[PDB]
Amino acid sequence: KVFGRCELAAAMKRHGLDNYRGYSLGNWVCAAKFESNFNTQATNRNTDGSTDYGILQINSRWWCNDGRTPGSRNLCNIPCSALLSSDITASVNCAKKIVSDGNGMNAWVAWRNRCKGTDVQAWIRGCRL
């Protein structure tokens, strides 16, 4: 599923991401934009052999199981395919664990490089929330 900007903002808010661990909704929408272009089916292979999955490009090295990432973990206790669903519940729940891991949203390199410090409120501007 390819979400609209405000549609994703609304879904993220309903699932409790607005100000989760202090990160306003615009941060999450901005991260999703540059990670996946709002596409739940996005996948991308990493140099180390792991793969990133879903709207927030969650990786198989630590967070989900895809059966092909040696020496990895599955700390969110989910198959990585669950992260590609039109239902973003699994992605959100896993994202909550990741952002609580210690480095906050810096876990998402694209958030650090393209969202952090910017006017992220722009990403939810005009949205009925």
Task: By CB under 5 A, name the binding residues for Cl ion.
Answer: 5, 11, 24-26, 65, 69, 72, 79, 87-88, 104, 121
Binding segment toward Na ion, per CB under 5 A, in 8-16, 36-44, 71-79, 89-97: 71-79
User: Strand runs (DSSP E) across 1-129, as ranges?
Assistant: 43-45, 51-53, 58-59
The helices-and-strands tally (H runs, E runs) of the chain is 4, 3
Binding segment toward Na ion, per CB under 5 A, in 11-19, 20-28, 67-75, 114-122: 67-75
User: How wide is the angle at C-alpha 39 spanned by C-alphas 35 and 44, nearest 5°?
Assistant: 50
Is residue 119 flagged as an active site residue?
no
Q: Is 60 in the site for Na ion (CB under 5 A)?
A: yes
Output the smallest distance, CB 74 to Na ion, in A: 5
Sole binder of Na ion in the list 28, 69, 92, 105 (CB under 5 A):
69
Contact between 51 and 57 (Cβ < 8 Å): no
Contact between 72 and 50 (Cβ < 8 Å): yes
- 119 labeled binding residue: no
Is residue 52 flagged as an active site residue?
yes
The number of beta carbons lying within 10 Å of the beta carbon of residue 102 is 8
| Nearest residue relative to Na ion (C-beta) | 72
Burial class (CB in 10 A: 0-12, 13-18, 19+), 71: exposed
Output the smallest distance, CB 107 to Cl ion, in A: 10
Q: List interacting residues with Na ion (CB under 5 A).
A: 60, 65, 69, 72, 74
Active-site residues, by number, are: 35, 52
